Amino acid sequence: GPLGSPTMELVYKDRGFYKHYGVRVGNAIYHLDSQDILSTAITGQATFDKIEDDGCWLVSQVADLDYFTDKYVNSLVGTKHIFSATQNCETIARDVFGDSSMTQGRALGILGVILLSAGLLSLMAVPWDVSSLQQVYNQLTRAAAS
Amino acid sequence: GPLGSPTMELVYKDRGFYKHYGVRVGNAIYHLDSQDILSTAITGQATFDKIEDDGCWLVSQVADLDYFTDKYVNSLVGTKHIFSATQNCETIARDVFGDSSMTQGRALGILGVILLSAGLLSLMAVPWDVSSLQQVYNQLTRA
């Protein structure tokens, strides 16, 4: 089902070792501004930026991705997250989620869930159907020592 | 090369979709206490714990992994990292690195880099030889 506002498009660039997702709204693309996904994870700091579409992004079929992302949207509602934004992201909540009452902060958290979920699932080559997504989610939430 | 003390081993359990890594010293295993890497990444909070070996861990051949992990350790020396630990890990520096003078924080940063690197590189199906690792390093860091 839908991830956000009526015109938001999940897009990506294929960087070979990983696919890098963003969201396109009109000619604006919102995405994480660093390719160093390992540094991002280790430091707990990720910054969104808004860029112009360069014509080189591909569109993702969203399929049932929301089944998976909703689990984290719900589970990390009252939880500090790692996402900040540049000054160019003033209207991200409205653009991406269609909700002017949502704070920028809350929008960054939800969008960061979506983009990291898409990127991780792509790395795992997991299709975005409910069955496949539930299977991955079960392994992610399995007790670490088990 | 070696990643730590002379008896330290890189170990994992295979979850199919990914491998969950830890480091072993004797029958003590130090690992992240959640394998929900999304929650870990989104919240910027990873907690090490120390468990007993159940005999069901596999040993990784480390090859040249330290070539890659050392680069990240060196980049994040004067840099906050996300790794904390339960109190069971008070002796991780002496156990894992063989250095009682090393701070717990420094030990956790190094081991966190190693475990996340191993996990990510495995997902990428990258040989842990220097040439392969230099190629993915260059892509990650935009050199």
Author numbering:
A (entry chain B): -4 to 141
B (entry chain A): -4 to 138
Study text:
Parechoviruses, including *Parechovirus A* that infects humans as well as *Parechovirus B* (formerly Ljungan virus) and *Parechovirus C* (formerly Sebokele virus) that infect rodents, belong to a group of picornaviruses whose 2A proteins, instead of being proteases, contain a conserved H-box and NC-motif and are homologous to a small cellular lipid-modifying enzyme (PLAAT3) that acts as a host factor, enabling the picornavirus life cycle. Despite the common evolutionary origin, 2A^H/NC^ proteins and PLAAT3 have no conserved function, as the active site of the viral proteins cannot support catalysis. Our structural analysis has shown that the topological rearrangement first observed in HPeV1 and leading to the apparent destruction of the active site configuration of the enzyme is indeed a general feature of *Parechovirus* 2A proteins. The C-terminal α5 region, which is a unique C-terminal extension so far only observed in *Parechovirus* 2A proteins, clearly plays a central role in determining the order of oligomerization as well as other correlated and sometimes far-reaching structural rearrangements.
Intrigued by this observed disorder in the C-terminal region of the *Parechovirus B* structures and its apparent influence on protein oligomerization, we decided to extend our structural characterization to the H/NC-motif type 2A_2_ of Sebokelevirus (SEBV1), the sole representative of *Parechovirus C*, which like *Parechovirus B* 2A_2_, exhibits shortened N- and C-termini compared to *Parechovirus A*. The structure of SEBV1-2A_2_ was determined to 1.56 Å resolution in space group P2_1_2_1_2 with two molecules in the asymmetric unit and was refined to 20.16% R_free_, no Ramachandran outliers, a Ramachandran Z-score of −0.40±0.53 and a Molprobity score of 1.16 (98^th^ percentile) ([Table tbl1]). All 134 residues could be modeled in both chains, and the final model includes an additional 5 residues at the N- and 7 residues at the C-terminus that were introduced during the cloning procedure, as well one ethylene glycol molecule, a tetraethylene glycol fragment and 256 water molecules. Overall, SEBV1-2A_2_ is similar to the LV 2A_2_ structures (3.70 Å over the full chain; 1.2 Å over the core 97 C_α_ residues), in SEBV1 however, the C-terminal α5 helix is well ordered (and extends to include two of the extra residues past the native protein boundaries) ([Fig fig1]). SEBV1-2A_2_ assembles into the same overall dimer configuration as HpeV1, despite having closer sequence identity with LV-2A_2_ ([Fig fig2]). In SEBV1-2A_2_, the C-terminal helix α5 folds back onto the globular domain, which positions it close to where α2 sits on HPeV1, and α2 shifts ∼7.5Å away from the interface.
